[PDB]
Design a protein around this ligand. Structure first.
Ligand SMILES: [Cl-]
Ligand SMILES: [Cl-]
Ligand SMILES: [Cl-]
Ligand SMILES: [Cl-]
Lengths: 173, 173, 173, 173
């Protein structure tokens, strides 16, 4: 058992474990999104790359939470990981809408844990989220919003042409 | 009071202060244009960058006028700065039309001050405008005209697609 | 309209627009202070430089707020900018007193927005101010206080001599 | 005789010769000022250097006028050079006042030649003065005005101390 734990509530400890699960679920969703866009009948390499990168980012977020759990003397507990919500993800527009919904759900979980930390007077937890998660999440959601607007502008007419152009001229590939 | 002032009319001194106001107003207009194109629901980064760069250029023009005012022994006087004429700027085409109108108004103010300087036999003022402002303004207006033509060619059909292509393939981003 | 806005109150959105106005007003005040010290009948280059640098810093603060407004899905709205409170700024001592008063007013606006963000449970806003504004402001006010003390020590007797020495041996020039 | 002269009036030709005389007279005045401040009983090295540099600058201005006279097919004619107006130049304040008076007289001669060139429709002459003389003269007069203000601030009380400090901390030495 821990000899280090101080000012670290059981409520926070549990919520951190739940948030690890949510990040790993998000990572898995992005893995599925990435490989869908690598299908020969979809074949949008830049979109594939975008989602593969996000799978890595979310895995890293979970690892940072687990590191923090140990630094505070909490105990990591892992649960089953639910499969992603879809097996096929539609168009780039459909996929980017699904990604924004996912990110808003993660952001809300961050905000809820921040509020719990505030209520429990756990400034280390609050700072940790502020420093490593909240701004990263706002920046990502802004980037996704920008992408959504551009995809919408392009597929309004000539959907196929528009989807190709976005992948070629906006996304990294 | 000044021990240096020579051949520097009160009329020119006042007109220079007015021109500083007009440049700072233009800078502010460009700031608003730049941030409008950074909105998540507009999201045209190259257009944002173009107008942000012009905000800087116009601020620098005002600073050069203020430096000159002091070099001649005139006295800088600042007035309120009017907010820009719009809060939302429409499409890239709408924005570039508004920018050309603005630039023509600045160019006319330059020409009017040049004529005043000529009438007052103030060759330093005339040279100063020739050397630092008049050609810069002609070059800018030509660039904006070129852009306008290209945007017009593109949005004639497929307005969304055209606006994206211009931002991606003409503007710096 | 925004597809990204989350946990971002209308009250905060408005207060951020007001704070942009206050920063741009401060920038304008510093521009006037800088050019006053460049007058041939004032001629304190280090003092000019000090205030010109602050005009840039305050403009950059406003730009960071506007960037943040867009990242959160708020809408930038610009108002008229009031001219500075004086047309002539007196001695270096008078100017540095006026600057401290200005900075304390900006600091109070930061603190008030922080308190609003706390009350609205907007940790991203609170963190943003903590990370980019509050410490910068404390450091600046301390520097100005240090300067004020040194100027006071010097102009107690031999005001002209003291003002020259401060400009030459403390300020950057 | 010239095979090249075109659009170059006898009036301009003569006035250019007179202006060469005035520049060489100014150069000679600065030579005397420079060596006065090198006296063992004056001994202000930075002031000496300042005026020696101006003697060179004025000689170079005369050489540029003579080059231009030949480029236009006019004929250089030299007259006697009057000695400087004083044999001893007083304090740094006295000397810098005398220098500003001299420079204003040169500036007025430039402006008068510009007006003659305008009246004679000689744009090459007008451009030549604009490009090589008028702005240089405005910048110099501003620098001298700045110096005068600083010297005045310093010698108001403790004249000896003030004169030393100006030489040590403003002038190049
Ligand atoms: Cl199980
Ligand atoms: Cl007013
Ligand atoms: Cl209004
Ligand atoms: Cl003779």
């Amino acid at each position: 058992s821990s000899q280090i734990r101080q000012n670290y509530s059981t409520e926070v400890e549990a919520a951190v474990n739940r948030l690890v699960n949510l990040y790993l679920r998000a990572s898995y969703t992005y893995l599925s999104l990435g490989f869908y866009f690598d299908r020969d009948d979809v074949a949008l390499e830049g979109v594939c790359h975008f989602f593969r990168e996000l799978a890595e980012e979310k895995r890293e977020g979970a690892e940072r939470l687990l590191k923090m759990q140990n630094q505070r003397g909490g105990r990591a507990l892992f649960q089953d990981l639910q499969k992603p919500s879809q097996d096929e993800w539609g168009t780039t527009l459909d996929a980017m809408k699904a990604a924004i919904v996912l990110e808003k759900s993660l952001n809300q979980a961050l905000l809820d844990l921040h509020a719990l930390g505030s209520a429990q007077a756990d400034p280390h937890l609050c700072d940790f989220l502020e420093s490593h998660f909240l701004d990263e999440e706002v920046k990502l959601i802004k980037k996704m919003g920008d992408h959504l607007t551009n995809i919408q502008r392009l597929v309004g007419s000539q959907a196929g042409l528009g989807e190709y152009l976005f992948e070629r001229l906006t996304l990294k590939h």
